[PDB]
């Protein structure tokens, strides 16, 4: 049982985690300005 | 009728929505500086 969807899916989850980290940092910078 | 393109496509739309949210926040920070 082999599939390539799960590895690229895990890459999608970790890049989405990096996106949420960037969103958290931008909310932090918006709080630092304001 | 089964396909894996729609679920990764919906993941693409929601990450693109997060990208547009990051772009909106960066335009907001550019307006806050200027």
State the helicity of chain A in percent bands: over 70%
Relative strand content of chain A? under 5%
Spatial extent as radius of gyration of chain A: 15 Å
N- and C-termini, Cα separation of chain A? 53 Å
Oligomeric state of shown chains: part of a larger assembly
Gross morphology of chain A is rod-shaped
Greatest interface (CB-CB under 8 A), with counts per chain: A-B, 16 and 14 residues
H and E order of chain A: H
Count the strands of chain A? 0
Largest sheet of chain A: none
Structural class of chain A: mainly alpha
Count of DSSP H/I helices of chain A? 1
PDB class: transport protein
Keywords: trpm8, transport protein
Entry title: Mouse TRPM8 in lipid nanodiscs in the presence of calcium, icilin and PI(4,5)P2
Chains A, B: Transient receptor potential cation channel subfamily M member 8
């Amino acid at each position: 049982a082999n599939d390539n969807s799960e590895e690229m899916r895990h890459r999608f989850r970790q890049l989405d985690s990096k996106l949420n980290d960037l969103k958290s940092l931008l909310k932090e910078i918006a709080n630092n300005i304001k």
